[PDB]
């Protein structure tokens, strides 16, 4: 018979299975649609989640209660040091989808990227790309490399660059094995894309060349892991009465008599967290460029001389010294987790998307407690230099 009362089902069937992701680095499932009329430009970037803080800004939203008022909103700091282009790959459009045609690598590869090709770098002989790097040293070999590039210009329909992070520059991560990913190149003709990619071989691409301030981006990564978990926490089913024999953190009925099988739509206990997620429409509030005032936490209203990093350092992460992005809201994953930034696939036209951000205050008090000092000097002056 019909259920006595109606409520929506617990959880979403669009995120199944709730298994551990088969990857640690966020995979870009779809790149932005390519517009040939625009200049060649990268579409994605890698970063590392440093921590969270809150900012205060004066809202400019005509017709809103907050118009010309101040609002406090949380933000996430993503440290985004420049990436290094080390190769190019071309794909051909076939009736069976895109097929990888060829992969051309740069002559010189850093030790950090070479570590990505080994499970035990120190114990190995470190032979990776040694024979490949030699054909850059001969005229006949150079001709072959150029011939491969011309082959991509003729047949390739999609061009992606091989780029890796400079993970050594963030000592807090305690990792020397860099992260490598394919970043699609949009804009221009195929020949321009290949020339654009080959020109960056062994060069650095700053985050500013991909993203900018006040634009909406998508963040891709793996959520925080939580291990084996019961239905109440995993799926949000309500608890059973106190007097339930054999426990109350369960689903009471897991199925009718017929079909004589448990269905895949019933909540079950299992892995929770460490799932791949793609979150949309994250506005960029600030882009910090090293060596510029934008890298500091100064604002047009607050002239206190201080850095982005809170006193005592970002908990579990360290001190941010490279380029970084200040992103509204929260980011997937734990501290130190590598996150993938992608350009929006939609046309951003809403007022919120076009709103011009103007920060008034950036909090830099300690996040390891009830921090009340924005700078170490302020704390020292408070206690008479302590």
């Amino acid at each position: 018979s019909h259920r006595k009362f109606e409520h929506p089902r617990h959880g979403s069937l669009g995120f199944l299975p709730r298994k551990r992701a088969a990857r640690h680095r966020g995979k870009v499932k779809a790149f932005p649609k390519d517009d040939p009329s625009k200049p060649c430009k990268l579409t994605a970037f890698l970063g590392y989640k440093a921590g969270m803080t809150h900012i205060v800004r004066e809202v400019e939203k005509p017709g809103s209660k907050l118009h010309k008022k101040e609002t406090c909103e949380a933000v996430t700091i993503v440290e985004t040091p420049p990436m290094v282009i080390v190769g190019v790959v071309g794909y051909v459009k076939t009736p069976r989808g895109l097929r990888c045609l060829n992969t051309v690598w740069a002559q010189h590869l850093s030790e950090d990227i070479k570590r990505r090709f080994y499970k035990n770098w120190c114990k190995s002989k470190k032979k990776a790309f040694l024979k490949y790097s030699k054909k850059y040293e001969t005229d006949e070999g150079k001709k072959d490399i150029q011939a491969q590039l011309e082959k991509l210009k003729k047949y390739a329909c999609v061009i992606r660059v091989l780029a890796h992070t400079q993970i050594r520059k963030m000592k807090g991560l305690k990792q020397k094995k860099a992260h490598l990913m394919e970043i699609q190149v949009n804009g221009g003709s195929i020949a321009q894309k290949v020339d654009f990619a080959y020109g960056f071989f062994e060069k650095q691409v700053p985050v500013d060349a991909v993203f900018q301030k006040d634009e909406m981006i998508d963040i891709i990564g793996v959520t925080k892991g939580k291990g084996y978990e019961g239905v109440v926490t995993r799926w949000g089913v309500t608890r059973l009465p106190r007097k339930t024999h054999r426990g109350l953190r369960k689903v009471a009925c897991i199925g009718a008599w017929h079909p004589a099988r448990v269905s895949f739509t019933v909540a079950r206990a299992g892995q929770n967290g460490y799932h791949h997620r793609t979150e949309m429409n994250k506005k960029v509030y600030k882009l910090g460029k090293v060596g510029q005032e934008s890298h500091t936490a100064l604002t047009e209203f607050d002239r206190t001389e201080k850095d982005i990093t809170p006193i005592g350092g970002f908990p579990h992460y360290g001190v941010v010294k490279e380029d970084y992005l200040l992103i509204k809201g929260c980011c997937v994953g734990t501290k130190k987790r590598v996150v993938t930034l992608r350009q929006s696939l939609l046309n951003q036209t809403s007022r919120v998307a076009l709103e011009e951000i103007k920060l008034k205050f950036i909090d830099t008090s300690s996040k390891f407690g009830h921090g009340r000092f924005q700078t170490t000097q302020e704390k020292q002056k408070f206690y008479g230099r302590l």
């Binding site: 205060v56 017709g63 118009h67 008022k69 609002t71 309500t238």
Partner: protein
Amino acid sequence: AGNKFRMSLGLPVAATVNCADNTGAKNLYIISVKGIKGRLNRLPSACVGDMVMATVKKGKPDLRKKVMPAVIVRQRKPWRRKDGVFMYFEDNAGVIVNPKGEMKGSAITGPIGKECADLWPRIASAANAIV
């Protein structure tokens, strides 16, 4: 103009709040909250500025055993202002009004939340301090 942002709900059904007006009622017993569409097993709840249907459990006999609308003016549950500050009052209070939001009484005792004053100009007129 703009509409009021969401606030933490601290007053579910069966909550008994003080009567902050001079109508003669001493407390208001919440039986429902206007605008609640609801969820299975979820008790309707109200915040400062919400209109609720209430009964007077203690007060003048002329006001008892009757269902009348009321507006919450204070609550003890902290709620977040847009500027990041969490506010709360020392008690829970409300005032009896008519379906159009006009006060049945003529005076208000104690302060009232700014959120309630913006939505109900009649209540704000009789208020002493708007915080």
